[PDB]
Design a protein around this ligand. Structure first.
Ligand SMILES: *[C@@H]1O[C@H](CO)[C@@H](O)[C@H](O)[C@H]1NC(C)=O
Ligand SMILES: *[C@@H]1O[C@H](CO)[C@@H](O)[C@H](O)[C@H]1NC(C)=O
Ligand SMILES: *[C@@H]1O[C@H](CO)[C@@H](O)[C@H](O)[C@H]1NC(C)=O
Ligand SMILES: *[C@@H]1O[C@H](CO)[C@@H](O)[C@H](O)[C@H]1NC(C)=O
Ligand SMILES: *[C@@H]1O[C@H](CO)[C@@H](O)[C@H](O)[C@H]1NC(C)=O
Ligand SMILES: *[C@@H]1O[C@H](CO)[C@@H](O)[C@H](O)[C@H]1NC(C)=O
Ligand SMILES: *[C@@H]1O[C@H](CO)[C@@H](O)[C@H](O)[C@H]1NC(C)=O
Lengths: 201, 596
């Protein structure tokens, strides 16, 4: 029939500010109509790599919930937002499962997220004792202990603050320019699936 | 846990906090260079002081990790680079004195203005006031006046400063477990810990002498030919048996002989390969020059320039209102920002310089994947050599015909190849004995082989023995004739040009064998060859992660610098010079026979 109540993709993609990768925002999307062809046919995205599903049948299939994780990383770190990858972002900031069904969408945001003095409003986790589990968020600001000596809460020698700021200048290279990444996670659970695609008339 | 993991985490923290700070310092230096204004000078000085203080604090933190408990070669290389004291091992009073001496030598060299006694109402600076006189005059006493007056003023100012400089630098170097400051400079080529590919600081002097002994017959024949032509130009001053007078070499110091090409041309009647008029007729902008250089680098298979390069580089002189340094410089600012600052004119020299500086940019782009403290050349010779090979390839008549800048009906006979090779010898071969003699003299000064009261008696003796150049009038110890040059007065290593010159032709033979060129080496062009670019990029991507001996194995298949590619490059010219020197006498006498 006639379809209304589209899913709020404007508040995820067109958000005025994005979260840092250590504190990535997760929005649960339920009970609406998700039109994915609007996103796929956009010319504004540089990466639209979908894992476990193809973008053409997204607008047909139906899912129980959609998890929209949003953050900002560097240009050279977009490749680490993938199943099975290794790096600072994958190990310590945002980990994707190997059995991941969803899409990784990234686009350049040098226009918004870079200022001439340097935009340091985006921090990443540089050190953690162990790698993250998939879809884990670590917002702890406890001093990393790299050595045998106790840190005692002060950043001295062999003891580092785990959160480090990104330097974003507009004159940086494309591998250092800020990229806004939205990861959509599609799961089907035994509850009635309510995030469905648009139905043609 | 372990020391190696601790050093790895410390190096991650260092690279992270030293990349943005190096980018700020480099951006401030760029803003000074494109805009000479006093607030930009202050911003540059503030960024440089922050960068140096951060390097002092990180070296102080870095020393607490002992070197012998780390087995990974890259981590040990970064820790070796970071743990150097520099001037920090020296006392604070002596460090301040050394910094003051370096700054005042920089100001004396930069603001040194010399003119004729009894006519002091206006005076000429070195660039371009004295450069044009040295490069273009044909008058014996005018060049003698300019040469002696500039070495009188500059040497008599700089001699006590250099006497303090040698003592302070030797004190700093022996405080850093080096034999002298010469050993500190030779430590750039030191490779330790790699099986077979180890290179020693003491092997550098032996290799330089061993290569120069093979340089010497070609330079002797070139010197005899230049002596005969300068005897034709100046009838009575030059002796058939003696050395060349010092002020007649076409440059201020004798660094290059390329300004004697007009006087010493073999076949003036035959045409030149000058392509300047052809670009003027087709209205080639500097943007077109750099786009043709980019076409050359994509033809060999190297990556093309970034968008930020075309947006952020200054490839044209800005104007009267905005001041900028005219010297062409390629800038690796950090964080993937690569720029060229060149005041590009429509000339062959600026076009070849564009190829040279974009070769510098390609070298900088290739090791961007490396860690921050390993983002350099494998030695100081490779970084300049990879630009000079592009200058070699772009200057060939095949490249000019291929891009349409030269007429397709231009006749390439043997005479044009001989005179082109002679121009390349005046640029390239002529700088080799001057470079070797200057570095050997500085090494003997730092080593203490030459006492301070005997610096100049030995120096002219070295110049007569090696370069075959005699002083016009004798100089006492009140003169400081070496420090009138830019590199020695401003604390720069000088063996990089010798090593660059040999690595240039070694890389050229390797890439021309890769490109399957079937003729003479100087007729070889490395465009259109993907495999030559791949062989180049294998070494280019390494940066300072691997030893320079292993990088040279990666390119040419040899573990050491070699002199045979240079001699193979100039072999037509060598046979022609041997034919032309039948009547004349090869070699010189170190006595005062022409004039003293
Ligand atoms: C976000 O902004 C772009 C830019 O104009 C626009 O085309 C697009 O429709 C907006 N919404 C979404 C969901 O992408
Ligand atoms: C150069 O400096 C002057 C002095 O502040 C400034 O007005 C001008 O905008 C600068 N040039 C550029 C291209 O920014
Ligand atoms: C040395 O460390 C680097 C990381 O900095 C690593 O990629 C490399 O494999 C290590 N090499 C060895 C031989 O362990
Ligand atoms: C740097 O100087 C300190 C101060 O004496 C010294 O302990 C350290 O060994 C020096 N480092 C090197 C590499 O010589
Ligand atoms: C560099 O080469 C790529 C690959 O063809 C091309 O897409 C890009 O536009 C080139 N860069 C510029 C600035 O033209
Ligand atoms: C060029 O070749 C011709 C013919 O072999 C010869 O007569 C002439 O001397 C050569 N010229 C030079 C400069 O080698
Ligand atoms: C190199 O390639 C370009 C484009 O294919 C071509 O125009 C040029 O003639 C080639 N160079 C040579 C020497 O063949």
């Amino acid at each position: 029939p006639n379809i209304t109540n589209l899913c709020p993709f404007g508040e995820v993609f067109n958000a005025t500010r994005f979260a840092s990768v250590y504190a990535w925002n997760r929005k649960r999307i339920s009970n609406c109509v998700a039109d994915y062809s609007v996103l796929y046919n956009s010319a504004s995205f540089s990466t639209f790599k979908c894992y476990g599903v193809s973008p053409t049948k997204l607008n047909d299939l139906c899912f129980t919930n959609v998890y929209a994780d949003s953050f900002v990383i560097r240009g050279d770190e977009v490749r680490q937002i993938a199943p099975g990858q290794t790096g600072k972002i994958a190990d310590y900031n945002y980990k994707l499962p190997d059995d991941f069904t969803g899409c990784v969408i990234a686009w350049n945001s040098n226009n918004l997220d870079s200022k001439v003095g340097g935009n340091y409003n985006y921090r990443y986790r540089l050190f953690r004792k162990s790698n993250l589990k998939p879809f884990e968020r670590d917002i702890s600001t406890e001093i990393y202990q790299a050595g045998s000596t106790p840190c005692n809460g002060v950043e001295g020698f062999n003891c580092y603050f785990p959160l480090q700021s990104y330097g974003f200048q507009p004159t940086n290279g494309v591998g250092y320019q800020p990229y806004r990444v939205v990861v959509l996670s599609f799961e089907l659970l035994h509850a009635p699936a309510t995030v469905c695609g648009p139905k043609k008339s | 846990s372990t020391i190696e993991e601790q050093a790895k985490t410390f190096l991650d923290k260092f690279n992270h906090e030293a990349e943005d700070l190096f980018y700020q310092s480099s951006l401030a230096s760029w803003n000074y260079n494109t805009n000479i204004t006093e607030e930009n000078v202050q911003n540059m000085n503030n960024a440089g002081d922050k960068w140096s203080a951060f390097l002092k604090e990180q070296s102080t933190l870095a020393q607490m990790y002992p070197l012998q408990e780390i087995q990974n070669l890259t981590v040990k290389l970064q820790l070796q680079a970071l743990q150097q004291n520099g001037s920090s091992v020296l006392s604070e009073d002596k460090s301040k004195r050394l910094n003051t001496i370096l700054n005042t030598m920089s100001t004396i060299y930069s603001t040194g203005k010399v003119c004729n006694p009894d006519n002091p109402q206006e005076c000429l600076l070195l660039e371009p006031g004295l450069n044009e006189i040295m490069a273009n005059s044909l008058d014996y006493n005018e060049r003698l006046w300019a040469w002696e007056s500039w070495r009188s003023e500059v040497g008599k100012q700089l001699r006590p400063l250099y006497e303090e400089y040698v003592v302070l630098k030797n004190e700093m170097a022996r405080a850093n477990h080096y034999e002298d400051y010469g050993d500190y400079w030779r430590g750039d080529y030191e490779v330790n810990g790699v099986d077979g590919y180890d290179y020693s600081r003491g092997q550098l002097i032996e290799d330089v002498e061993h290569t120069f002994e093979e340089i010497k017959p070609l330079y002797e024949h070139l010197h005899a030919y230049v002596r005969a032509k300068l005897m034709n130009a100046y009838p009575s001053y030059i002796s058939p048996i003696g050395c060349l007078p010092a002020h007649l070499l076409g440059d201020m110091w004798g660094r290059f002989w390329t300004n004697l090409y007009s006087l010493t041309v073999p076949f003036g009647q035959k045409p030149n390969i000058d392509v300047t008029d052809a670009m003027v007729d087709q209205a080639w902008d500097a943007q077109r020059i750099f786009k043709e250089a980019e076409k050359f680098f994509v033809s060999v298979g190297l990556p093309n320039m970034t968008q930020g390069f075309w947006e952020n580089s200054m490839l044209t002189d800005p104007g009267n209102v905005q001041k900028a340094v005219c010297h062409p410089t390629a800038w690796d600012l950090g964080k993937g920002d690569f720029r060229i600052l060149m005041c590009t004119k429509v000339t062959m020299d600026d076009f070849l310089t564009a190829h040279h500086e974009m070769g510098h940019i390609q070298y900088d782009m290739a090791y961007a994947a490396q860690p921050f403290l390993l983002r350099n050349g494998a030695n100081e010779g490779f970084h300049e050599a990879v630009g000079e090979i592009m200058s070699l390839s772009a200057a060939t008549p095949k490249h000019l015909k291929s891009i349409g800048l030269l007429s397709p009906d231009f006749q390439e006979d043997n005479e044009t190849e001989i005179n082109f090779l002679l121009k390349q010898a005046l640029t390239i071969v002529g700088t080799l004995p001057f470079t070797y003699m200057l570095e050997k003299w500085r090494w003997m000064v730092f080593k203490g082989e030459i006492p301070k009261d005997q610096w100049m008696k030995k120096w002219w003796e070295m110049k007569r023995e090696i370069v075959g150049v005699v002083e016009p009038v004798p100089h006492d110890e009140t003169y400081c004739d070496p420090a009138s040059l830019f590199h020695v007065s401003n604390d720069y290593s000088f063996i990089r040009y010798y090593t660059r010159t040999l690595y240039q032709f070694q890389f050229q033979e390797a890439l021309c064998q890769a490109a399957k060129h079937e003729g003479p080496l100087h007729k070889c062009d490395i465009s259109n060859s993907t495999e030559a670019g791949q062989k180049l990029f294998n070494m280019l991507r390494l940066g300072k992660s691997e030893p320079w001996t292993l990088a040279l194995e990666n390119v040419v298949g040899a573990k050491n610098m070699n002199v045979r590619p240079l001699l193979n490059y100039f072999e037509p010219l060598f046979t022609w010079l041997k034919d032309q020197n039948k009547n004349s006498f090869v070699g010189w006498s170190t006595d005062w026979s022409p004039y003293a």
